[PDB]
Short mmCIF file of all heavy atoms in Angstrom, two decimals:
data_model
loop_
_atom_site.label_atom_id
_atom_site.label_comp_id
_atom_site.label_asym_id
_atom_site.label_seq_id
_atom_site.Cartn_x
_atom_site.Cartn_y
_atom_site.Cartn_z
N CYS I 1 0.79 -1.19 0.04
CA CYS I 1 -0.02 0.01 -0.05
C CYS I 1 0.83 1.24 -0.02
O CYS I 1 0.63 2.13 -0.84
CB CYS I 1 -0.98 -0.05 1.22
SG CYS I 1 -2.26 -1.35 0.94
N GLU I 2 1.92 1.24 0.86
CA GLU I 2 2.78 2.47 1.01
C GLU I 2 3.59 2.67 -0.17
O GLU I 2 3.79 3.84 -0.56
CB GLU I 2 3.71 2.17 2.24
CG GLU I 2 4.56 3.37 2.67
CD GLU I 2 5.51 3.17 3.68
OE1 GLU I 2 5.71 2.00 4.01
OE2 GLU I 2 6.11 4.10 4.21
N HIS I 3 4.06 1.59 -0.89
CA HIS I 3 4.90 1.65 -2.02
C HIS I 3 4.10 1.71 -3.30
O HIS I 3 4.69 2.00 -4.41
CB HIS I 3 5.71 0.33 -2.17
CG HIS I 3 6.89 0.24 -1.33
ND1 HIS I 3 6.86 -0.11 0.01
CD2 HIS I 3 8.24 0.40 -1.57
CE1 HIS I 3 8.07 -0.04 0.54
NE2 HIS I 3 8.89 0.23 -0.30
N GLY I 4 2.70 1.59 -3.25
CA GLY I 4 1.86 1.67 -4.40
C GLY I 4 2.17 0.47 -5.40
O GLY I 4 1.96 0.71 -6.70
N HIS I 5 2.45 -0.69 -4.91
CA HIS I 5 2.67 -1.82 -5.80
C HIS I 5 1.26 -2.52 -5.96
O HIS I 5 0.89 -3.42 -5.16
CB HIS I 5 3.66 -2.92 -4.97
CG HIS I 5 4.99 -2.29 -5.02
ND1 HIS I 5 5.64 -1.51 -5.99
CD2 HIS I 5 6.03 -2.49 -4.08
CE1 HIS I 5 6.88 -1.24 -5.66
NE2 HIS I 5 7.14 -1.65 -4.49
N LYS I 6 0.56 -2.07 -6.97
CA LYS I 6 -0.85 -2.40 -7.12
C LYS I 6 -1.07 -3.89 -7.43
O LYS I 6 -1.98 -4.57 -6.74
CB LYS I 6 -1.56 -1.63 -8.31
CG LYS I 6 -1.44 -0.14 -8.20
CD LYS I 6 -1.73 0.54 -9.57
CE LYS I 6 -0.76 1.74 -9.86
NZ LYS I 6 -0.48 2.52 -8.67
N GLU I 7 -0.18 -4.45 -8.23
CA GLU I 7 -0.16 -5.87 -8.77
C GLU I 7 0.05 -6.80 -7.47
O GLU I 7 -0.63 -7.75 -7.30
CB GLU I 7 0.80 -6.15 -9.82
CG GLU I 7 0.66 -5.15 -10.93
CD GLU I 7 1.66 -3.76 -11.05
OE1 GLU I 7 1.74 -3.22 -9.96
OE2 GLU I 7 2.10 -3.61 -12.09
N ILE I 8 1.09 -6.41 -6.66
CA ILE I 8 1.44 -7.22 -5.50
C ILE I 8 0.24 -7.09 -4.44
O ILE I 8 -0.09 -8.17 -3.78
CB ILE I 8 2.88 -6.73 -4.85
CG1 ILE I 8 4.03 -7.10 -5.87
CG2 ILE I 8 3.03 -7.10 -3.51
CD1 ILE I 8 5.31 -6.42 -5.60
N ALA I 9 -0.31 -5.83 -4.25
CA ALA I 9 -1.44 -5.73 -3.32
C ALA I 9 -2.56 -6.67 -3.83
O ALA I 9 -3.17 -7.48 -2.88
CB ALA I 9 -2.02 -4.37 -3.33
N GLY I 10 -2.84 -6.82 -5.09
CA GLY I 10 -3.88 -7.66 -5.63
C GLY I 10 -3.49 -9.17 -5.38
O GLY I 10 -4.45 -9.85 -4.95
N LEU I 11 -2.19 -9.47 -5.42
CA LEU I 11 -1.70 -10.90 -5.08
C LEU I 11 -2.07 -11.18 -3.59
O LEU I 11 -2.62 -12.31 -3.34
CB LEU I 11 -0.29 -11.01 -5.47
CG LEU I 11 -0.16 -11.06 -7.00
CD1 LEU I 11 1.46 -10.98 -7.24
CD2 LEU I 11 -0.76 -12.20 -7.70
N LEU I 12 -1.67 -10.18 -2.80
CA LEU I 12 -1.85 -10.43 -1.32
C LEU I 12 -3.31 -10.54 -0.95
O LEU I 12 -3.74 -11.35 -0.20
CB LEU I 12 -1.08 -9.22 -0.60
CG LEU I 12 0.36 -9.35 -0.68
CD1 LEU I 12 1.01 -8.09 -0.06
CD2 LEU I 12 0.99 -10.54 -0.12
N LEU I 13 -4.11 -9.66 -1.47
CA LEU I 13 -5.63 -9.62 -1.26
C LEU I 13 -6.28 -10.87 -1.80
O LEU I 13 -7.39 -11.13 -1.34
CB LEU I 13 -6.23 -8.36 -1.75
CG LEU I 13 -5.79 -7.17 -1.03
CD1 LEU I 13 -6.20 -5.86 -1.87
CD2 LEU I 13 -6.44 -7.05 0.33
N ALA I 14 -5.68 -11.58 -2.77
CA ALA I 14 -6.14 -12.85 -3.36
C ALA I 14 -5.93 -14.00 -2.30
O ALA I 14 -6.40 -15.20 -2.61
CB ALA I 14 -5.64 -13.10 -4.71
N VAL I 15 -5.22 -13.77 -1.32
CA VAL I 15 -4.87 -14.83 -0.35
C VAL I 15 -6.14 -14.85 0.65
O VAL I 15 -6.50 -13.90 1.28
CB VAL I 15 -3.58 -14.60 0.48
CG1 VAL I 15 -3.38 -15.57 1.50
CG2 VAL I 15 -2.50 -14.60 -0.53
N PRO I 16 -6.78 -16.08 0.68
CA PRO I 16 -8.09 -16.09 1.54
C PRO I 16 -7.98 -15.58 2.90
O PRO I 16 -8.89 -15.03 3.42
CB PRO I 16 -8.44 -17.60 1.52
CG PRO I 16 -7.57 -18.23 0.49
CD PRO I 16 -6.48 -17.35 0.20
N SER I 17 -6.89 -15.93 3.64
CA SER I 17 -6.78 -15.62 5.16
C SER I 17 -6.12 -14.22 5.30
O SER I 17 -5.87 -13.74 6.43
CB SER I 17 -5.96 -16.60 5.83
OG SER I 17 -4.67 -16.60 5.22
N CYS I 18 -5.98 -13.43 4.21
CA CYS I 18 -5.42 -12.06 4.28
C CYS I 18 -6.25 -11.32 5.25
O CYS I 18 -7.47 -11.06 5.01
CB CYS I 18 -5.35 -11.41 2.98
SG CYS I 18 -4.56 -9.75 3.22
N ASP I 19 -5.67 -10.73 6.47
CA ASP I 19 -6.32 -10.05 7.46
C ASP I 19 -6.11 -8.65 7.29
O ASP I 19 -5.08 -8.08 7.60
CB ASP I 19 -5.88 -10.60 8.85
CG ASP I 19 -6.55 -9.97 10.07
OD1 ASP I 19 -7.32 -8.93 9.75
OD2 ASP I 19 -6.36 -10.28 11.15
N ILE I 20 -7.18 -7.81 6.85
CA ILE I 20 -6.99 -6.54 6.33
C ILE I 20 -7.20 -5.51 7.70
O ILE I 20 -6.91 -4.34 7.59
CB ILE I 20 -7.79 -5.95 5.29
CG1 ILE I 20 -9.29 -5.96 5.61
CG2 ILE I 20 -7.46 -6.87 4.10
CD1 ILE I 20 -10.23 -5.44 4.50
N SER I 21 -7.57 -6.12 8.87
CA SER I 21 -7.90 -5.40 10.05
C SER I 21 -6.63 -5.18 10.87
O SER I 21 -6.68 -4.22 11.74
CB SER I 21 -8.87 -6.18 10.84
OG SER I 21 -8.21 -7.27 11.71
N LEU I 22 -5.48 -5.82 10.63
CA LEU I 22 -4.24 -5.64 11.35
C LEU I 22 -3.73 -4.11 11.39
O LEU I 22 -3.92 -3.51 10.37
CB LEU I 22 -3.15 -6.56 10.83
CG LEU I 22 -3.45 -8.06 11.16
CD1 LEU I 22 -2.42 -8.95 10.36
CD2 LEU I 22 -3.40 -8.44 12.65
N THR I 23 -3.20 -3.77 12.49
CA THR I 23 -2.59 -2.41 12.56
C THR I 23 -1.14 -2.41 12.97
O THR I 23 -0.72 -3.38 13.75
CB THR I 23 -3.37 -1.61 13.73
OG1 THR I 23 -3.47 -2.36 14.90
CG2 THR I 23 -4.75 -1.24 13.23
N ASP I 24 -0.37 -1.54 12.54
CA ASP I 24 0.90 -1.32 12.78
C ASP I 24 1.26 -0.50 14.15
O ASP I 24 0.14 -0.28 14.81
CB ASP I 24 1.80 -0.72 11.63
CG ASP I 24 1.35 0.75 11.38
OD1 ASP I 24 0.79 1.42 12.20
OD2 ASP I 24 1.77 1.31 10.37
N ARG I 25 2.40 -0.13 14.44
CA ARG I 25 2.62 0.38 15.78
C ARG I 25 2.07 1.83 15.84
O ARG I 25 1.96 2.24 17.02
CB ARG I 25 4.09 0.33 16.12
CG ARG I 25 5.02 1.27 15.34
CD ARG I 25 6.03 1.56 16.39
NE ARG I 25 7.36 2.14 15.88
CZ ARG I 25 8.20 2.91 16.61
NH1 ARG I 25 7.98 3.12 17.90
NH2 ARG I 25 9.28 3.31 16.08
N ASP I 26 1.85 2.45 14.83
CA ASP I 26 0.98 3.82 14.64
C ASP I 26 -0.43 3.63 14.67
O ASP I 26 -1.17 4.71 14.59
CB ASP I 26 1.47 4.66 13.51
CG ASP I 26 3.01 4.87 13.60
OD1 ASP I 26 3.60 4.99 14.72
OD2 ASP I 26 3.56 5.06 12.52
N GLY I 27 -1.07 2.44 14.85
CA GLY I 27 -2.42 2.04 14.73
C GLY I 27 -3.07 2.12 13.38
O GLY I 27 -4.25 2.20 13.19
N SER I 28 -2.25 2.10 12.26
CA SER I 28 -2.69 2.18 10.87
C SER I 28 -3.06 0.86 10.43
O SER I 28 -2.21 -0.01 10.57
CB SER I 28 -1.64 2.94 10.08
OG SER I 28 -1.47 4.28 10.57
N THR I 29 -4.11 0.74 9.64
CA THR I 29 -4.56 -0.52 8.81
C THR I 29 -3.89 -0.30 7.44
O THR I 29 -3.52 0.82 7.18
CB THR I 29 -6.08 -0.61 8.79
OG1 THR I 29 -6.49 0.60 8.17
CG2 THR I 29 -6.78 -0.84 10.08
N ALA I 30 -4.00 -1.44 6.61
CA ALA I 30 -3.67 -1.28 5.20
C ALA I 30 -4.41 -0.19 4.50
O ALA I 30 -3.81 0.62 3.74
CB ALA I 30 -3.94 -2.61 4.46
N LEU I 31 -5.61 -0.08 4.78
CA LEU I 31 -6.60 0.95 4.15
C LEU I 31 -6.04 2.32 4.48
O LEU I 31 -5.92 3.18 3.58
CB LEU I 31 -7.99 0.79 4.47
CG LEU I 31 -8.93 1.92 3.95
CD1 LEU I 31 -8.98 1.91 2.44
CD2 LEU I 31 -10.35 1.72 4.52
N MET I 32 -5.67 2.59 5.66
CA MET I 32 -5.27 3.92 6.10
C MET I 32 -3.89 4.25 5.41
O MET I 32 -3.73 5.37 4.94
CB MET I 32 -4.99 3.98 7.65
CG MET I 32 -6.33 4.12 8.41
SD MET I 32 -6.17 3.64 10.09
CE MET I 32 -5.32 5.07 10.73
N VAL I 33 -3.08 3.20 5.19
CA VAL I 33 -1.83 3.40 4.59
C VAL I 33 -1.95 3.69 3.11
O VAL I 33 -1.40 4.67 2.59
CB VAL I 33 -0.80 2.28 4.76
CG1 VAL I 33 0.37 2.25 3.97
CG2 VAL I 33 -0.45 2.09 6.30
N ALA I 34 -2.90 2.93 2.48
CA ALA I 34 -3.19 3.17 1.06
C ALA I 34 -3.76 4.61 0.83
O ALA I 34 -3.30 5.27 -0.12
CB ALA I 34 -4.31 2.11 0.60
N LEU I 35 -4.73 5.09 1.64
CA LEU I 35 -5.29 6.40 1.44
C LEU I 35 -4.18 7.41 1.61
O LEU I 35 -4.09 8.38 0.88
CB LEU I 35 -6.45 6.60 2.39
CG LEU I 35 -7.64 5.66 2.07
CD1 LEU I 35 -8.71 5.76 3.31
CD2 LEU I 35 -8.26 5.99 0.75
N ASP I 36 -3.37 7.29 2.66
CA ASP I 36 -2.23 8.24 3.07
C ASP I 36 -1.27 8.43 1.93
O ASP I 36 -0.69 9.36 1.60
CB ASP I 36 -1.61 7.95 4.37
CG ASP I 36 -0.64 9.00 4.70
OD1 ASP I 36 -1.02 10.23 4.75
OD2 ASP I 36 0.38 8.67 5.26
N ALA I 37 -1.02 7.16 1.18
CA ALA I 37 -0.15 7.17 0.02
C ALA I 37 -0.74 7.58 -1.29
O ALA I 37 0.00 7.54 -2.29
CB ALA I 37 0.53 5.71 -0.01
N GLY I 38 -2.01 7.98 -1.19
CA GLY I 38 -2.81 8.33 -2.47
C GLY I 38 -2.92 7.18 -3.43
O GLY I 38 -2.80 7.35 -4.64
N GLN I 39 -3.22 5.92 -2.91
CA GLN I 39 -3.36 4.72 -3.63
C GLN I 39 -4.88 4.36 -3.75
O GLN I 39 -5.38 3.44 -3.24
CB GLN I 39 -2.49 3.67 -3.02
CG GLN I 39 -1.06 3.85 -3.06
CD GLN I 39 -0.45 4.07 -4.38
OE1 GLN I 39 -0.89 3.42 -5.30
NE2 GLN I 39 0.45 5.02 -4.59
N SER I 40 -5.68 5.18 -4.67
CA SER I 40 -7.12 4.95 -4.71
C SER I 40 -7.39 3.65 -5.28
O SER I 40 -8.39 3.08 -4.77
CB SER I 40 -7.58 6.16 -5.75
OG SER I 40 -7.54 7.26 -5.24
N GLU I 41 -6.65 3.17 -6.22
CA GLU I 41 -6.87 1.86 -6.85
C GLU I 41 -6.77 0.75 -5.80
O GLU I 41 -7.57 -0.24 -5.80
CB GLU I 41 -5.97 1.60 -7.99
CG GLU I 41 -6.60 1.56 -9.33
CD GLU I 41 -5.67 1.06 -10.45
OE1 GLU I 41 -4.94 2.05 -10.95
OE2 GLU I 41 -5.63 -0.10 -10.77
N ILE I 42 -5.69 0.71 -4.98
CA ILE I 42 -5.57 -0.22 -3.96
C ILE I 42 -6.73 -0.15 -2.95
O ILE I 42 -7.19 -1.08 -2.39
CB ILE I 42 -4.08 -0.11 -3.26
CG1 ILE I 42 -2.96 -0.52 -4.31
CG2 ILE I 42 -3.96 -1.07 -2.16
CD1 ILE I 42 -1.61 -0.33 -3.84
N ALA I 43 -6.98 1.17 -2.59
CA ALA I 43 -8.23 1.24 -1.67
C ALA I 43 -9.42 0.61 -2.27
O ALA I 43 -10.12 -0.18 -1.53
CB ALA I 43 -8.41 2.71 -1.41
N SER I 44 -9.72 0.85 -3.61
CA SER I 44 -10.93 0.01 -4.29
C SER I 44 -10.73 -1.37 -4.21
O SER I 44 -11.67 -2.13 -4.03
CB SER I 44 -10.98 0.58 -5.75
OG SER I 44 -11.10 1.98 -5.68
N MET I 45 -9.51 -1.93 -4.31
CA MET I 45 -9.33 -3.41 -4.31
C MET I 45 -9.64 -3.81 -2.84
O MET I 45 -10.24 -4.92 -2.62
CB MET I 45 -7.87 -3.82 -4.63
CG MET I 45 -7.53 -3.47 -6.06
SD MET I 45 -5.81 -3.32 -6.41
CE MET I 45 -5.18 -4.82 -5.50
N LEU I 46 -9.27 -3.10 -1.80
CA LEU I 46 -9.62 -3.39 -0.39
C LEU I 46 -11.22 -3.37 -0.23
O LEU I 46 -11.72 -4.35 0.32
CB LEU I 46 -8.89 -2.43 0.53
CG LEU I 46 -7.41 -2.63 0.78
CD1 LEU I 46 -6.80 -1.36 1.29
CD2 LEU I 46 -7.16 -3.71 1.64
N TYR I 47 -11.86 -2.38 -0.85
CA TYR I 47 -13.35 -2.30 -0.72
C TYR I 47 -14.08 -3.45 -1.42
O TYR I 47 -15.04 -4.04 -0.89
CB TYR I 47 -13.84 -0.94 -1.22
CG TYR I 47 -13.29 0.29 -0.49
CD1 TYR I 47 -13.05 1.48 -1.25
CD2 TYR I 47 -13.05 0.24 0.89
CE1 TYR I 47 -12.67 2.58 -0.64
CE2 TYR I 47 -12.58 1.31 1.54
CZ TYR I 47 -12.38 2.55 0.79
OH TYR I 47 -11.93 3.70 1.47
#
């Protein structure tokens, strides 16, 4: 999400047990990181 690797994000989200609710030490989820990085497309893949 941070790097804007759209193809890689899609591969990771294709993994059934991918947990999008996890937070890093700043309390950020993947969605928060995608929005902060201006990754609209990765945000849509998360949705």
Side-chain angles (χ1 to χ4, degrees):
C1 288
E2 188 187 10
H3 283 80
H5 296 323
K6 306 162 225 314
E7 310 99 313
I8 288 167
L11 291 170
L12 291 175
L13 292 164
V15 174
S17 63
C18 186
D19 183 350
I20 70 172
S21 82
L22 293 171
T23 55
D24 68 11
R25 75 147 159 154
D26 303 331
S28 297
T29 60
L31 174 62
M32 289 164 70
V33 171
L35 296 172
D36 191 46
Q39 299 298 324
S40 290
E41 248 188 278
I42 298 174
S44 303
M45 298 160 44
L46 287 160
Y47 301 148

